[PDB]
Design a protein around this ligand. Structure first.
Ligand SMILES: N=C(N)NC[C@@H](O)CC(=O)C(=O)O
Ligand SMILES: N=C(N)NC[C@@H](O)CC(=O)C(=O)O
Lengths: 377, 378
């Protein structure tokens, strides 16, 4: 019940629970907000397909996925969880069991379980050594589908630490062994413009390999758009028609006004190479790291500079549940890790997640209070 | 293929009379809301999410005159009525419930539940025409443990409100007596508001008092010209509320507080003008369609409720709705053939055509003139 813990924090003093964006608008993003009336009238007079096309083009240009634009088969929905429910309907129709990454944000588990998809965990550590990925998958993936989250939420882990080879090994395994490969790329924006970690064209690999796949992309966790957002799903050619028919039963269209607005955010971030996103996260990440260094919350350095920070509880008795209780009694709301080890929540009582997509002044105040609370125990 | 895919193609066309989504422009007071979008954005950044949920829900159920829903204060918000329907689908599957679903109805209601592997069986709308036959007809025909109605119905505009309170009271009596889950899609209910005889009564008072197990879905997207930046509402009976709450929270944490803030302005604006700016556009186009097609091969089917779609019967010896759709689209006018509204037996829909009325009157009048010109050739 992550969302329910995030519902409570949304009312609270220092909400560091949900990863939704709550930083304010940059100077140039304020120029988008100021033009919302113009963007409204544009969408009212133009064609729906125009705003879909321009959003999809801007998005995959920023993310440097040109193969996705050549194939031109991506479908848009209100949110990544909606795209996930479309994938869930496909998994249920094919009666497939899923091997799902663990840890991962629990709402992925919850939505798939709620559509009665069988779920079996595979630990993130199977991906740490590039030359062991394939034999580890051969041992441990004993279902017809494999569902990854890359970069991962909450750890920031990514196969991109291995260049192309990590993903190539996963795709090799799934092709060789007739596995459907599902990948949630919602955190992939945080790799962009990184000298070593910037995502390559994933769709070139997925298409060239001929693997059966479903790939989900997102805007909501990248930009401060107050959850007025859009997610994207792309399927391999062999299942595209089935998935298309499932998708059209859910919605006809995303708001062309929202799409028009989102396109401006994407273009704005192309212009500043995502600086207004990255700099806010870096300031809060550094503040958390320096504030909590040496405390019972042991910072877990992520592969990718994602919008959440992950900590191990380094104490002989206290759990993450204890830590969450103590911090919330003083008005600071974090998430216990239980909410991420969906197959075995007690494993998550060793970890805590904090959201970084926050105004830095509020975040710094929350960090000062957090260390003061922790220092009493 | 489904009606939504027909609507994707029509959305690329000038005379799109297919999707029921709102495509009329803004009223003068609605252009004021548009001018405040920057302030509505910054307000939602500074305020609490729960504040915008509460203010929206209050405005919505004040306009719809559903005070019981505000007392219970257990309604959950989602991106769209189909998303609320998928939450209902998750509950139906968890409880092994099959659904007796109204026919005709817009096909994605059938399709999305079928795509969730919910077993579905039709019940014809005519079961509800005679108030004193509703209960015995349901006893003889409903052989599932859930019953899913759409009221007012899409595409016919039919409503149990023709019977005052008694039609809904008989449906609820049946479902309570026989331990059935009652699901009701109220997305068209705004079109009853301020009607002297048809204005919806407080449905949640009846649902709560009866003790019936229920899921009730409400919508904004079909009412206001908000370019599908919208919100739907679902309310569950107390005995299933906790299960449904947990299902709902797996789908989304929150609707955009910016969108909620904006929608609240539209709801308040329509309270101030008694939905005049919505009703007048539909009236202008409904009357244009009726006058243009009177005596034509498209026979207007008068609805109980003045909903945002018009329903026509094909009155011709040989031509079907499929033929009419092809003939009109060949000349640039896109309507929906009735086939898919009869989701259990599409051949029954080959005698019907649906036209969307939530359109700019000038475009709609030009579409009607072109439609008449095509039909005048057969
Ligand atoms: N699959 C979906 N949700 N299609 C859009 C739906 O709004 C169309 C509709 O219901 C109508 O045109 O009356
Ligand atoms: N069931 C859903 N969709 N909850 C909201 C989700 O955005 C929260 C989340 O995934 C995170 O905070 O990382």
């Amino acid at each position: 019940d992550l969302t329910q813990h995030e519902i409570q924090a949304l009312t609270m003093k220092y909400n560091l629970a949900d990863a939704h964006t709550h930083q304010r608008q940059s100077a140039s993003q304020q120029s988008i907000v100021s033009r919302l009336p113009q963007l409204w009238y544009e969408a009212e007079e133009g064609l729906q397909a125009t705003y879909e096309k321009r959003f999809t083009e801007a998005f995959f240009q920023l993310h440097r996925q040109p193969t996705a634009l050549v194939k031109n088969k991506t479908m848009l929905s209100y949110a990544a969880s909606i795209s996930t429910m479309v994938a869930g309907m496909f998994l249920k129709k094919e009666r497939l069991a899923v091997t799902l990454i663990e840890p991962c944000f629990d709402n992925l588990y919850d939505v798939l379980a709620n559509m009665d998809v069988p779920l079996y965990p595979i630990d993130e550590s199977v991906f740490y050594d590039v030359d062991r990925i394939y034999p580890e998958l051969e041992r441990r993936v004993r279902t017809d589908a494999l569902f990854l989250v890359d970069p991962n939420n909450p750890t920031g882990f990514s196969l991109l630490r291995h260049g192309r080879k990590g993903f190539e090994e996963v795709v090799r395994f799934c092709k060789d062994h007739d596995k459907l490969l599902l990948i949630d790329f919602c955190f992939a924006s945080f790799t962009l413009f990184e000298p070593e970690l910037a995502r390559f064209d994933m769709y070139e690999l997925l298409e060239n390999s001929g693997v059966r796949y479903l790939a989900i992309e997102d805007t909501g966790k990248t930009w401060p758009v107050q959850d007025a957002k859009c997610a994207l799903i792309t399927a391999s050619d062999d299942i595209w028609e089935t998935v298309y028919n499932l998708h059209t039963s859910v919605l006809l269209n995303v708001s062309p006004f929202v799409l028009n607005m989102l396109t401006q955010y994407v273009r704005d971030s192309a212009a500043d190479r995502l600086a207004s996103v990255r700099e806010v996260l870096t300031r809060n990440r550094e503040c958390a790291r320096k504030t909590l260094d040496g405390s019972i919350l042991e910072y877990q350095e992520p592969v990718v500079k994602v919008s959440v920070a992950w900590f191990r509880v380094d104490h002989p008795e206290l759990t993450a549940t204890d830590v969450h209780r103590l911090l919330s009694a003083d008005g600071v709301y974090v998430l216990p890790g239980r909410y991420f080890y969906w197959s075995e929540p007690s494993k998550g009582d060793a970890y805590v997640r904090m959201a970084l997509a926050r105004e830095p002044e509020m975040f710094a105040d929350a960090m000062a209070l957090t260390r003061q609370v922790l220092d009493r125990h």
